[PDB]
Amino acid sequence: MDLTNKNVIFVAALGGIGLDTSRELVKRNLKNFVILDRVENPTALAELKAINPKVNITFHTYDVTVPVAESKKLLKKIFDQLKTVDILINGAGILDDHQIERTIAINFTGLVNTTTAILDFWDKRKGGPGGIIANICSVTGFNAIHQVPVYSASKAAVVSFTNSLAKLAPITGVTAYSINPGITRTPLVHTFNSWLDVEPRVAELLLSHPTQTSEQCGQNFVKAIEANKNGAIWKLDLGTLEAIEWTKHWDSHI
Amino acid sequence: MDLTNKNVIFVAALGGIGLDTSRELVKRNLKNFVILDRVENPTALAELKAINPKVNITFHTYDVTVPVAESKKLLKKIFDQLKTVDILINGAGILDDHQIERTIAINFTGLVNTTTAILDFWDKRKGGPGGIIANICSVTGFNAIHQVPVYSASKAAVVSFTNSLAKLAPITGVTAYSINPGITRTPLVHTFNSWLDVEPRVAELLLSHPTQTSEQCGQNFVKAIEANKNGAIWKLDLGTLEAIEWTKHWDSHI
Ligand SMILES: CC(=O)Cc1cc[n+]([C@@H]2O[C@H](COP(=O)([O-])OP(=O)(O)OC[C@H]3O[C@@H](n4cnc5c(N)ncnc54)[C@H](O)[C@@H]3O)[C@@H](O)[C@H]2O)cc1C(N)=O
Ligand SMILES: CC(=O)Cc1cc[n+]([C@@H]2O[C@H](COP(=O)([O-])OP(=O)(O)OC[C@H]3O[C@@H](n4cnc5c(N)ncnc54)[C@H](O)[C@@H]3O)[C@@H](O)[C@H]2O)cc1C(N)=O
């Protein structure tokens, strides 16, 4: 798909992977780039606006742990201005297995709730135009980092949820694919809590293995968006972009 | 493992799969069988007690959506009386993708919290004896029923979470394995809501394919418990018991 003149909403665009993805995205001559993020970052906004003055960049404070009704309210405001939105990127994520409930609320529930809210505007059953959802999941949704079992389980959830969304496309009009980075040097992984501190040095041990930069990650992210393959499960690991095949262990037949 | 004179806690023992599993379990001459479930069923209780009068059967009202501190409170009493608990079975589950938050809270968060609570009594790092966790996940954790994407993603999370538990056993002393039933004729699947009603006939379509009874499921469940294989991923589908191999797509190296 061609990003020229598209309207994009990116939830959690100002994080480490987000920001480097965002720098590449706004190079593509979007019409509108809507950033939804919990925490203002004024420096990153100015930087992004610097790169490509043609793009209209707007920022709205958004916490993905709000109720679906609050998401719908905010999204109505955005559709009211923009009329159409082509792509939603769900990128919010924390890594701290001391915060069990909060990990699941942000990494899993909130992504489902934002998706659920936007379907109100996109669902072809309601007359909507359909749309495209890019979900930032994680290779730990494939195979856990088992010293952070909660984080990894929340990401296994959103890989599954994204697979299912992609299979609902003929009914809803909304296609979907997951973006699953391998270990990427950002503030997320520099220091973090393991579950019941089974491994207090998890961050040190993790970064003694090969990693990628957020710029490598960001570059491959935009390529996967431009590939626009419904149901792809993209692995972005050590600077490459690869589609994995999900194992069929069981089939519901429906 | 030999179940004779074992002490078992079974969360959600009085449901469709639970009850048929429980009938087999109490045949094995447990010392103590502790049922935790959201509501008492004196019919089922009296039945179970009838089958094997040697087993001491106790019931406590438990909702898995309470905070960890409440779980610990309840567990502390149980450990104090029984002194040792050999096996915990987490089986609570709902199926209703109109209740997004509630699905996640019961199917995923609640299982994590019960597990987190009991580790206080079992963790070998704290002087505990270690222990055995059997988690009821679902084949939809392998491959979704995509008309109930939230239910299925919640079960993908607990499969992942169970795999990670099993890999933490050398540190915690607590082994674990998942029990993943295929479609099993119980009140769970007779009628249920799909997500945004993408498929209002999901139950009808599902039960037009081969199923298994809860008695078949129940028999194979006790065999898997007797197999006692840490890290097993057990599929209980169409009356068989099979261990699946999880695909290694990615490795954390730690
Ligand atoms: C460890 C791992 O998962 C491997 C890899 C894959 C996935 N991820 C994921 O990629 C995404 C971005 O992570 P990062 O490395 O950029 O981390 P980061 O902490 O720099 O970025 C976090 C982003 O999520 C947003 N966010 C957090 N809580 C929010 C809330 N309640 N509402 C709205 N936004 C919220 C922040 O405001 C910020 O924009 C996350 O979803 C994360 O889980 C990270 C990596 C990595 N850094 O190596
Ligand atoms: C549908 C599917 O995923 C295939 C299969 C695999 C796994 N499962 C899982 O098996 C387990 C039992 O399902 P079932 O079919 O016996 O359903 P059921 O409705 O008869 O039983 C639900 C059990 O969970 C308990 N429970 C629910 N909410 C609770 C709460 N808040 N606190 C404490 N306990 C609570 C109930 O009280 C009951 O004991 C669930 O984890 C379920 O998701 C069912 C099937 C099946 N029935 O075909």
PDB file of C-alpha atoms in Angstrom, chain A:
ATOM      1  CA  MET A   1       0.000   0.000   0.000  1.00  0.00           C
ATOM      2  CA  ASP A   2       1.054   3.564  -0.793  1.00  0.00           C
ATOM      3  CA  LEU A   3       1.229   5.816   2.278  1.00  0.00           C
ATOM      4  CA  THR A   4       1.034   9.091   0.300  1.00  0.00           C
ATOM      5  CA  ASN A   5      -1.934  11.153   1.508  1.00  0.00           C
ATOM      6  CA  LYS A   6      -3.019   8.546   4.047  1.00  0.00           C
ATOM      7  CA  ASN A   7      -4.421   9.306   7.476  1.00  0.00           C
ATOM      8  CA  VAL A   8      -2.738   7.255  10.204  1.00  0.00           C
ATOM      9  CA  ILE A   9      -3.468   6.962  13.914  1.00  0.00           C
ATOM     10  CA  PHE A  10      -0.507   5.639  15.933  1.00  0.00           C
ATOM     11  CA  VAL A  11      -1.180   4.736  19.568  1.00  0.00           C
ATOM     12  CA  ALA A  12       2.057   5.096  21.551  1.00  0.00           C
ATOM     13  CA  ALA A  13       4.027   6.666  18.711  1.00  0.00           C
ATOM     14  CA  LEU A  14       6.500   8.526  20.979  1.00  0.00           C
ATOM     15  CA  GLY A  15       8.191   5.501  22.549  1.00  0.00           C
ATOM     16  CA  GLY A  16      11.563   4.098  21.537  1.00  0.00           C
ATOM     17  CA  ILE A  17      10.293   1.867  18.692  1.00  0.00           C
ATOM     18  CA  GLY A  18       7.372   4.231  18.086  1.00  0.00           C
ATOM     19  CA  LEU A  19       9.517   7.343  17.564  1.00  0.00           C
ATOM     20  CA  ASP A  20      11.833   5.690  15.048  1.00  0.00           C
ATOM     21  CA  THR A  21       8.870   4.178  13.255  1.00  0.00           C
ATOM     22  CA  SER A  22       7.266   7.626  13.258  1.00  0.00           C
ATOM     23  CA  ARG A  23      10.340   9.285  11.715  1.00  0.00           C
ATOM     24  CA  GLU A  24      10.118   6.870   8.775  1.00  0.00           C
ATOM     25  CA  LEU A  25       6.347   7.149   8.433  1.00  0.00           C
ATOM     26  CA  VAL A  26       6.297  10.959   8.146  1.00  0.00           C
ATOM     27  CA  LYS A  27       8.882  10.736   5.361  1.00  0.00           C
ATOM     28  CA  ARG A  28       6.112   9.049   3.314  1.00  0.00           C
ATOM     29  CA  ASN A  29       3.934  12.141   2.850  1.00  0.00           C
ATOM     30  CA  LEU A  30       0.990  11.175   4.970  1.00  0.00           C
ATOM     31  CA  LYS A  31      -1.852  13.682   4.940  1.00  0.00           C
ATOM     32  CA  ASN A  32      -2.532  13.385   8.651  1.00  0.00           C
ATOM     33  CA  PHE A  33      -0.545  11.667  11.396  1.00  0.00           C
ATOM     34  CA  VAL A  34      -2.440  11.445  14.664  1.00  0.00           C
ATOM     35  CA  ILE A  35      -0.358  10.533  17.720  1.00  0.00           C
ATOM     36  CA  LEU A  36      -2.177   9.122  20.715  1.00  0.00           C
ATOM     37  CA  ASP A  37       0.081   8.691  23.734  1.00  0.00           C
ATOM     38  CA  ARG A  38      -0.219   8.733  27.462  1.00  0.00           C
ATOM     39  CA  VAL A  39       2.580  11.166  28.166  1.00  0.00           C
ATOM     40  CA  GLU A  40       3.337  14.360  26.254  1.00  0.00           C
ATOM     41  CA  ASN A  41       6.798  14.525  24.678  1.00  0.00           C
ATOM     42  CA  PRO A  42       7.208  18.038  23.246  1.00  0.00           C
ATOM     43  CA  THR A  43      10.718  17.514  21.792  1.00  0.00           C
ATOM     44  CA  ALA A  44       9.700  14.495  19.720  1.00  0.00           C
ATOM     45  CA  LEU A  45       6.671  16.349  18.375  1.00  0.00           C
ATOM     46  CA  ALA A  46       8.844  19.220  17.157  1.00  0.00           C
ATOM     47  CA  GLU A  47      11.364  16.814  15.672  1.00  0.00           C
ATOM     48  CA  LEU A  48       8.667  14.929  13.758  1.00  0.00           C
ATOM     49  CA  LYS A  49       7.104  18.122  12.461  1.00  0.00           C
ATOM     50  CA  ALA A  50      10.590  19.220  11.351  1.00  0.00           C
ATOM     51  CA  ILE A  51      11.121  16.164   9.138  1.00  0.00           C
ATOM     52  CA  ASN A  52       8.220  16.709   6.743  1.00  0.00           C
ATOM     53  CA  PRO A  53       6.278  19.934   6.924  1.00  0.00           C
ATOM     54  CA  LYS A  54       3.702  18.627   4.432  1.00  0.00           C
ATOM     55  CA  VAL A  55       2.312  16.175   7.015  1.00  0.00           C
ATOM     56  CA  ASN A  56      -0.274  17.444   9.509  1.00  0.00           C
ATOM     57  CA  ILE A  57       0.795  16.044  12.858  1.00  0.00           C
ATOM     58  CA  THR A  58      -1.630  16.207  15.757  1.00  0.00           C
ATOM     59  CA  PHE A  59      -1.190  14.890  19.305  1.00  0.00           C
ATOM     60  CA  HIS A  60      -3.860  13.795  21.745  1.00  0.00           C
ATOM     61  CA  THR A  61      -3.324  12.475  25.245  1.00  0.00           C
ATOM     62  CA  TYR A  62      -4.687   8.906  25.372  1.00  0.00           C
ATOM     63  CA  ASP A  63      -4.382   6.182  28.007  1.00  0.00           C
ATOM     64  CA  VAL A  64      -5.300   2.749  26.577  1.00  0.00           C
ATOM     65  CA  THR A  65      -6.605   1.639  30.022  1.00  0.00           C
ATOM     66  CA  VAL A  66      -9.729   3.837  29.672  1.00  0.00           C
ATOM     67  CA  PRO A  67     -13.103   2.204  29.056  1.00  0.00           C
ATOM     68  CA  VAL A  68     -14.223   1.549  25.483  1.00  0.00           C
ATOM     69  CA  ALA A  69     -16.758   4.420  25.720  1.00  0.00           C
ATOM     70  CA  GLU A  70     -13.945   6.889  26.350  1.00  0.00           C
ATOM     71  CA  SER A  71     -11.976   5.551  23.384  1.00  0.00           C
ATOM     72  CA  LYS A  72     -15.041   5.938  21.139  1.00  0.00           C
ATOM     73  CA  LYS A  73     -15.501   9.542  22.324  1.00  0.00           C
ATOM     74  CA  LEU A  74     -11.914  10.403  21.419  1.00  0.00           C
ATOM     75  CA  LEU A  75     -12.036   8.574  18.093  1.00  0.00           C
ATOM     76  CA  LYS A  76     -15.242  10.429  17.154  1.00  0.00           C
ATOM     77  CA  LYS A  77     -13.419  13.727  17.632  1.00  0.00           C
ATOM     78  CA  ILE A  78     -10.653  12.461  15.300  1.00  0.00           C
ATOM     79  CA  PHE A  79     -13.006  11.059  12.597  1.00  0.00           C
ATOM     80  CA  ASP A  80     -14.949  14.346  12.813  1.00  0.00           C
ATOM     81  CA  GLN A  81     -11.830  16.248  11.778  1.00  0.00           C
ATOM     82  CA  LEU A  82     -10.310  13.794   9.352  1.00  0.00           C
ATOM     83  CA  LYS A  83     -13.401  12.113   7.910  1.00  0.00           C
ATOM     84  CA  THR A  84     -11.525   8.901   7.044  1.00  0.00           C
ATOM     85  CA  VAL A  85      -8.676   7.076   8.808  1.00  0.00           C
ATOM     86  CA  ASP A  86      -6.839   4.466   6.757  1.00  0.00           C
ATOM     87  CA  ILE A  87      -4.581   2.767   9.348  1.00  0.00           C
ATOM     88  CA  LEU A  88      -4.547   2.350  13.140  1.00  0.00           C
ATOM     89  CA  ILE A  89      -1.286   1.248  14.777  1.00  0.00           C
ATOM     90  CA  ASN A  90      -1.653  -0.129  18.311  1.00  0.00           C
ATOM     91  CA  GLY A  91       1.773   0.195  19.980  1.00  0.00           C
ATOM     92  CA  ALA A  92       1.269   0.699  23.761  1.00  0.00           C
ATOM     93  CA  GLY A  93       3.321  -1.645  25.941  1.00  0.00           C
ATOM     94  CA  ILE A  94       4.889  -1.860  29.389  1.00  0.00           C
ATOM     95  CA  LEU A  95       7.401  -4.355  30.711  1.00  0.00           C
ATOM     96  CA  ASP A  96       7.181  -4.879  34.435  1.00  0.00           C
ATOM     97  CA  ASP A  97       6.075  -8.210  35.844  1.00  0.00           C
ATOM     98  CA  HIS A  98       5.691  -6.683  39.276  1.00  0.00           C
ATOM     99  CA  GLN A  99       2.592  -4.943  37.837  1.00  0.00           C
ATOM    100  CA  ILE A 100       0.531  -7.984  36.915  1.00  0.00           C
ATOM    101  CA  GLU A 101      -2.843  -6.336  36.442  1.00  0.00           C
ATOM    102  CA  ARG A 102      -1.363  -3.263  34.768  1.00  0.00           C
ATOM    103  CA  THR A 103       0.663  -5.298  32.247  1.00  0.00           C
ATOM    104  CA  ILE A 104      -2.446  -7.195  31.134  1.00  0.00           C
ATOM    105  CA  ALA A 105      -4.590  -4.000  31.103  1.00  0.00           C
ATOM    106  CA  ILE A 106      -2.179  -2.168  28.804  1.00  0.00           C
ATOM    107  CA  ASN A 107      -0.595  -4.891  26.676  1.00  0.00           C
ATOM    108  CA  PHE A 108      -3.765  -6.897  26.054  1.00  0.00           C
ATOM    109  CA  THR A 109      -7.040  -5.418  27.243  1.00  0.00           C
ATOM    110  CA  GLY A 110      -6.296  -1.901  26.048  1.00  0.00           C
ATOM    111  CA  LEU A 111      -5.319  -3.064  22.549  1.00  0.00           C
ATOM    112  CA  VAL A 112      -8.580  -5.043  22.331  1.00  0.00           C
ATOM    113  CA  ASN A 113     -10.562  -2.047  23.598  1.00  0.00           C
ATOM    114  CA  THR A 114      -9.070   0.423  21.107  1.00  0.00           C
ATOM    115  CA  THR A 115      -9.697  -2.068  18.319  1.00  0.00           C
ATOM    116  CA  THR A 116     -13.255  -2.623  19.544  1.00  0.00           C
ATOM    117  CA  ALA A 117     -13.895   1.145  19.672  1.00  0.00           C
ATOM    118  CA  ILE A 118     -12.622   1.881  16.173  1.00  0.00           C
ATOM    119  CA  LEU A 119     -14.742  -0.902  14.649  1.00  0.00           C
ATOM    120  CA  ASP A 120     -17.760   1.303  15.406  1.00  0.00           C
ATOM    121  CA  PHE A 121     -16.455   3.693  12.725  1.00  0.00           C
ATOM    122  CA  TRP A 122     -14.998   1.101  10.358  1.00  0.00           C
ATOM    123  CA  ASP A 123     -17.321  -1.925  10.478  1.00  0.00           C
ATOM    124  CA  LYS A 124     -18.650  -2.572   6.964  1.00  0.00           C
ATOM    125  CA  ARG A 125     -21.764  -4.098   8.592  1.00  0.00           C
ATOM    126  CA  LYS A 126     -22.559  -0.562   9.861  1.00  0.00           C
ATOM    127  CA  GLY A 127     -21.813   1.119   6.529  1.00  0.00           C
ATOM    128  CA  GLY A 128     -18.196   1.898   7.435  1.00  0.00           C
ATOM    129  CA  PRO A 129     -15.371   1.743   4.906  1.00  0.00           C
ATOM    130  CA  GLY A 130     -13.273  -0.933   6.634  1.00  0.00           C
ATOM    131  CA  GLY A 131      -9.683  -0.177   7.586  1.00  0.00           C
ATOM    132  CA  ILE A 132      -6.245  -1.525   8.476  1.00  0.00           C
ATOM    133  CA  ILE A 133      -4.952  -2.419  11.986  1.00  0.00           C
ATOM    134  CA  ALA A 134      -1.259  -2.889  12.652  1.00  0.00           C
ATOM    135  CA  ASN A 135      -0.673  -4.349  16.135  1.00  0.00           C
ATOM    136  CA  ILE A 136       2.704  -4.160  17.842  1.00  0.00           C
ATOM    137  CA  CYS A 137       2.997  -7.575  19.511  1.00  0.00           C
ATOM    138  CA  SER A 138       6.360  -9.209  20.254  1.00  0.00           C
ATOM    139  CA  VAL A 139       8.373 -12.333  19.482  1.00  0.00           C
ATOM    140  CA  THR A 140       7.735 -13.268  23.189  1.00  0.00           C
ATOM    141  CA  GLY A 141       4.148 -13.876  22.070  1.00  0.00           C
ATOM    142  CA  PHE A 142       5.633 -16.713  20.019  1.00  0.00           C
ATOM    143  CA  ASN A 143       8.046 -18.034  22.598  1.00  0.00           C
ATOM    144  CA  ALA A 144       8.101 -16.503  26.032  1.00  0.00           C
ATOM    145  CA  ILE A 145      10.828 -14.778  27.864  1.00  0.00           C
ATOM    146  CA  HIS A 146       9.936 -17.031  30.789  1.00  0.00           C
ATOM    147  CA  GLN A 147      11.452 -14.795  33.480  1.00  0.00           C
ATOM    148  CA  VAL A 148       8.754 -12.314  32.512  1.00  0.00           C
ATOM    149  CA  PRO A 149       5.860 -14.754  32.067  1.00  0.00           C
ATOM    150  CA  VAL A 150       3.105 -12.143  32.450  1.00  0.00           C
ATOM    151  CA  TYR A 151       4.481  -9.752  29.868  1.00  0.00           C
ATOM    152  CA  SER A 152       5.069 -12.640  27.445  1.00  0.00           C
ATOM    153  CA  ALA A 153       1.596 -14.111  28.018  1.00  0.00           C
ATOM    154  CA  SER A 154      -0.026 -10.698  27.374  1.00  0.00           C
ATOM    155  CA  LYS A 155       1.837 -10.634  24.062  1.00  0.00           C
ATOM    156  CA  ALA A 156       0.863 -14.220  23.225  1.00  0.00           C
ATOM    157  CA  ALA A 157      -2.717 -12.922  23.609  1.00  0.00           C
ATOM    158  CA  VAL A 158      -2.405 -10.026  21.179  1.00  0.00           C
ATOM    159  CA  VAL A 159      -0.697 -12.241  18.502  1.00  0.00           C
ATOM    160  CA  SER A 160      -3.730 -14.536  18.770  1.00  0.00           C
ATOM    161  CA  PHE A 161      -6.212 -11.643  18.791  1.00  0.00           C
ATOM    162  CA  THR A 162      -4.516 -10.236  15.673  1.00  0.00           C
ATOM    163  CA  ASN A 163      -4.668 -13.568  13.847  1.00  0.00           C
ATOM    164  CA  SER A 164      -8.390 -13.717  14.588  1.00  0.00           C
ATOM    165  CA  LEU A 165      -9.039 -10.132  13.456  1.00  0.00           C
ATOM    166  CA  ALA A 166      -7.437 -10.957  10.121  1.00  0.00           C
ATOM    167  CA  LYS A 167      -9.811 -13.909   9.745  1.00  0.00           C
ATOM    168  CA  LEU A 168     -12.790 -11.628  10.481  1.00  0.00           C
ATOM    169  CA  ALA A 169     -11.953  -9.283   7.590  1.00  0.00           C
ATOM    170  CA  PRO A 170     -14.560 -10.575   5.105  1.00  0.00           C
ATOM    171  CA  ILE A 171     -17.226  -9.719   7.716  1.00  0.00           C
ATOM    172  CA  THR A 172     -15.862  -6.537   9.231  1.00  0.00           C
ATOM    173  CA  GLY A 173     -13.935  -4.923   6.359  1.00  0.00           C
ATOM    174  CA  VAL A 174     -10.930  -4.532   8.702  1.00  0.00           C
ATOM    175  CA  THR A 175      -7.669  -6.279   7.863  1.00  0.00           C
ATOM    176  CA  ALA A 176      -4.920  -6.815  10.402  1.00  0.00           C
ATOM    177  CA  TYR A 177      -1.375  -7.972  10.851  1.00  0.00           C
ATOM    178  CA  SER A 178       1.028  -8.128  13.743  1.00  0.00           C
ATOM    179  CA  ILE A 179       4.441  -6.558  13.995  1.00  0.00           C
ATOM    180  CA  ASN A 180       6.663  -8.640  16.268  1.00  0.00           C
ATOM    181  CA  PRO A 181      10.029  -7.085  17.057  1.00  0.00           C
ATOM    182  CA  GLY A 182      12.870  -9.109  18.495  1.00  0.00           C
ATOM    183  CA  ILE A 183      14.969  -7.553  21.270  1.00  0.00           C
ATOM    184  CA  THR A 184      15.353  -3.900  20.393  1.00  0.00           C
ATOM    185  CA  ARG A 185      17.507  -1.405  22.265  1.00  0.00           C
ATOM    186  CA  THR A 186      15.021   1.037  23.841  1.00  0.00           C
ATOM    187  CA  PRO A 187      14.297   2.145  27.407  1.00  0.00           C
ATOM    188  CA  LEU A 188      11.800  -0.757  27.731  1.00  0.00           C
ATOM    189  CA  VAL A 189      14.537  -3.381  28.041  1.00  0.00           C
ATOM    190  CA  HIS A 190      17.325  -1.480  29.832  1.00  0.00           C
ATOM    191  CA  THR A 191      16.190  -2.468  33.291  1.00  0.00           C
ATOM    192  CA  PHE A 192      12.986  -4.313  34.251  1.00  0.00           C
ATOM    193  CA  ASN A 193      11.304  -6.451  36.943  1.00  0.00           C
ATOM    194  CA  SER A 194      10.903 -10.207  36.555  1.00  0.00           C
ATOM    195  CA  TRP A 195       7.902 -12.034  37.996  1.00  0.00           C
ATOM    196  CA  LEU A 196       8.416 -12.675  41.729  1.00  0.00           C
ATOM    197  CA  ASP A 197      12.004 -11.674  40.991  1.00  0.00           C
ATOM    198  CA  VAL A 198      12.935 -15.113  39.686  1.00  0.00           C
ATOM    199  CA  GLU A 199      15.640 -13.353  37.674  1.00  0.00           C
ATOM    200  CA  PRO A 200      16.696  -9.944  39.011  1.00  0.00           C
ATOM    201  CA  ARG A 201      19.345  -9.677  36.258  1.00  0.00           C
ATOM    202  CA  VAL A 202      16.973 -10.428  33.375  1.00  0.00           C
ATOM    203  CA  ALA A 203      17.802  -7.177  31.536  1.00  0.00           C
ATOM    204  CA  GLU A 204      21.574  -7.663  31.844  1.00  0.00           C
ATOM    205  CA  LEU A 205      21.303 -11.253  30.592  1.00  0.00           C
ATOM    206  CA  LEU A 206      18.960 -10.302  27.764  1.00  0.00           C
ATOM    207  CA  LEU A 207      21.285  -7.636  26.346  1.00  0.00           C
ATOM    208  CA  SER A 208      24.295  -9.974  26.388  1.00  0.00           C
ATOM    209  CA  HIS A 209      22.782 -11.479  23.228  1.00  0.00           C
ATOM    210  CA  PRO A 210      22.474  -9.901  19.785  1.00  0.00           C
ATOM    211  CA  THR A 211      19.961  -7.053  19.514  1.00  0.00           C
ATOM    212  CA  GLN A 212      18.734  -4.656  16.818  1.00  0.00           C
ATOM    213  CA  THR A 213      18.474  -0.886  16.980  1.00  0.00           C
ATOM    214  CA  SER A 214      15.143   0.931  17.007  1.00  0.00           C
ATOM    215  CA  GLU A 215      16.128   2.464  13.658  1.00  0.00           C
ATOM    216  CA  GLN A 216      16.482  -0.967  12.073  1.00  0.00           C
ATOM    217  CA  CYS A 217      13.227  -1.897  13.718  1.00  0.00           C
ATOM    218  CA  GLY A 218      11.556   1.327  12.575  1.00  0.00           C
ATOM    219  CA  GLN A 219      12.665   0.860   8.965  1.00  0.00           C
ATOM    220  CA  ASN A 220      11.350  -2.704   8.740  1.00  0.00           C
ATOM    221  CA  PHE A 221       8.086  -1.647  10.416  1.00  0.00           C
ATOM    222  CA  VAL A 222       7.282   0.758   7.617  1.00  0.00           C
ATOM    223  CA  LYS A 223       8.141  -1.863   4.998  1.00  0.00           C
ATOM    224  CA  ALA A 224       5.660  -4.305   6.561  1.00  0.00           C
ATOM    225  CA  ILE A 225       3.016  -1.579   6.568  1.00  0.00           C
ATOM    226  CA  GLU A 226       3.707  -0.974   2.895  1.00  0.00           C
ATOM    227  CA  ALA A 227       3.457  -4.718   2.255  1.00  0.00           C
ATOM    228  CA  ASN A 228      -0.093  -4.545   3.676  1.00  0.00           C
ATOM    229  CA  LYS A 229      -0.626  -8.325   3.993  1.00  0.00           C
ATOM    230  CA  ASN A 230      -3.790  -9.187   5.931  1.00  0.00           C
ATOM    231  CA  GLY A 231      -3.013 -11.894   8.491  1.00  0.00           C
ATOM    232  CA  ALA A 232       0.770 -11.586   8.218  1.00  0.00           C
ATOM    233  CA  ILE A 233       2.692 -12.329  11.392  1.00  0.00           C
ATOM    234  CA  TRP A 234       5.790 -10.199  10.869  1.00  0.00           C
ATOM    235  CA  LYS A 235       8.979 -10.947  12.710  1.00  0.00           C
ATOM    236  CA  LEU A 236      11.352  -7.952  12.957  1.00  0.00           C
ATOM    237  CA  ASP A 237      14.467  -9.381  14.462  1.00  0.00           C
ATOM    238  CA  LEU A 238      18.151  -8.550  14.149  1.00  0.00           C
ATOM    239  CA  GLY A 239      17.537  -6.065  11.354  1.00  0.00           C
ATOM    240  CA  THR A 240      15.441  -8.349   9.147  1.00  0.00           C
ATOM    241  CA  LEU A 241      11.770  -8.546   8.251  1.00  0.00           C
ATOM    242  CA  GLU A 242      10.279 -12.055   8.003  1.00  0.00           C
ATOM    243  CA  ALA A 243       6.759 -13.490   7.848  1.00  0.00           C
ATOM    244  CA  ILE A 244       6.284 -16.528  10.096  1.00  0.00           C
ATOM    245  CA  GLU A 245       3.835 -19.381   9.583  1.00  0.00           C
ATOM    246  CA  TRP A 246       1.608 -20.127  12.575  1.00  0.00           C
ATOM    247  CA  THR A 247       1.474 -23.847  13.445  1.00  0.00           C
ATOM    248  CA  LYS A 248      -1.977 -25.399  12.893  1.00  0.00           C
ATOM    249  CA  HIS A 249      -2.288 -27.624  15.988  1.00  0.00           C
ATOM    250  CA  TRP A 250      -6.069 -27.592  16.021  1.00  0.00           C
ATOM    251  CA  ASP A 251      -8.851 -26.363  13.788  1.00  0.00           C
ATOM    252  CA  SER A 252     -12.301 -25.346  14.861  1.00  0.00           C
ATOM    253  CA  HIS A 253     -13.667 -26.125  11.390  1.00  0.00           C
ATOM    254  CA  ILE A 254     -15.682 -22.865  11.363  1.00  0.00           C
TER     255      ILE A 254
END
